[PDB]
């Protein structure tokens, strides 16, 4: 149960032990490349919760994204910009999910989980072989990750009426003139 | 009469059977469908393995018909099985 302890420690992230680690890692990540690779996740509990396994075909990539406005605001989140930049780099892989790892005054740091649809360990496993299908090509570009589902308003309730099936589909439904035969 | 006003008691006829349902001038296709429904079915019984009957045969020769001692003996019951389970297993083999 080492990951329950990690979950409680990740919650407490301004405290002394973690803020020390977040300071020394941000210095290291700054002097590495923008879209460099990680051999192991920096937050193994968050990677595990999001679907990462220690299996051939799963890789982790670290991205730095510039923070701030676009008083126009870019409607794409910084996680969604991070996910789009891995997929354009690792064009053979499928973006599973992403998570926050570090912060600065100029940059935000994210770690992205990628799944290889062309490995044989992936195609053999029925828990991850769904991503092998051609519908899931470039999920981060269509707003199909957890960031994209958030920014598209894909929740249920009176509070999410305009965007619960897609706003462009709902606007097409609400602006269509339906004429029947025996009017 | 009925003391406690429960509507379920008027409809009646803690475990139930789980893989089948015990069930108690008409068209010919319907008459056929009840015929293969209630036709007799082969049992297709399951046998114990050769090592299983050898495990029980070793046990009965040592102790006998005293199922309690077979439960608390480590050298011939290494898996430490309850005497009621061995009694049920012995009945399947035929040994008392």
């Amino acid at each position: 149960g080492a990951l329950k302890y990690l979950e409680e420690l990740s919650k407490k992230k301004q405290s002394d032990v973690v803020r020390f680690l977040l300071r020394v890692r941000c210095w290291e990540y700054r002097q590495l490349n923008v879209i460099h690779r990680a051999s192991r996740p920096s937050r193994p509990d968050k990677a595990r919760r999001l679907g990462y396994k220690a299996k051939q075909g799963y890789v982790i990539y670290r991205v730095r994204v510039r923070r701030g406005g676009r008083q126009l605001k870019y409607q794409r989140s910084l996680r969604a910009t991070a996910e789009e930049r891995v997929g354009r780099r690792c064009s053979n892989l499928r973006v599973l999910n992403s998570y926050w790892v570090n912060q600065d005054s100029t940059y935000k740091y994210y770690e992205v989980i990628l799944v290889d649809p062309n490995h044989k360990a992936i195609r053999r496993d029925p828990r991850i072989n769904w991503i092998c299908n051609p519908v899931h090509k470039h999920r981060e570009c269509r707003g199909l990750t957890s960031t994209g589902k958030k920014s598209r308003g894909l929740n249920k309730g009176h509070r999410f009426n305009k965007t619960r099936a897609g706003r462009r589909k709902t606007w097409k439904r609400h602006n269509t003139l339906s004429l029947w035969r025996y009017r | 009469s009925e003391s406690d006003a429960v509507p379920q008691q008027q409809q009646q006829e803690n475990h139930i059977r789980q893989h089948d349902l015990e069930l108690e001038s008409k068209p010919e296709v319907l008459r056929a469908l009840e015929r293969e429904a209630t036709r007799p079915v082969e049992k297709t019984v399951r046998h114990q393995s050769e090592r299983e009957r050898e495990w029980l045969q070793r046990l009965v020769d040592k102790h006998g018909d005293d199922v309690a001692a077979m439960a608390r003996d480590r050298k011939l019951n290494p898996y430490q099985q309850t005497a009621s389970d061995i009694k049920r297993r012995l009945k399947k083999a035929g040994l008392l």
């Binding site: 029925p126 828990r127 | 893989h19 319907l30 469908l33």
Partner: peptide
């Protein structure tokens, strides 16, 4: 398929039945 879904489909499969009129 997974082992947990094979064990389910083995012992509880889609039975064949009819309803009288």
């Amino acid at each position: 398929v997974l082992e947990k879904t094979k064990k389910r489909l083995t012992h509880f499969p889609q039975r064949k039945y009819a309803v009288k009129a």
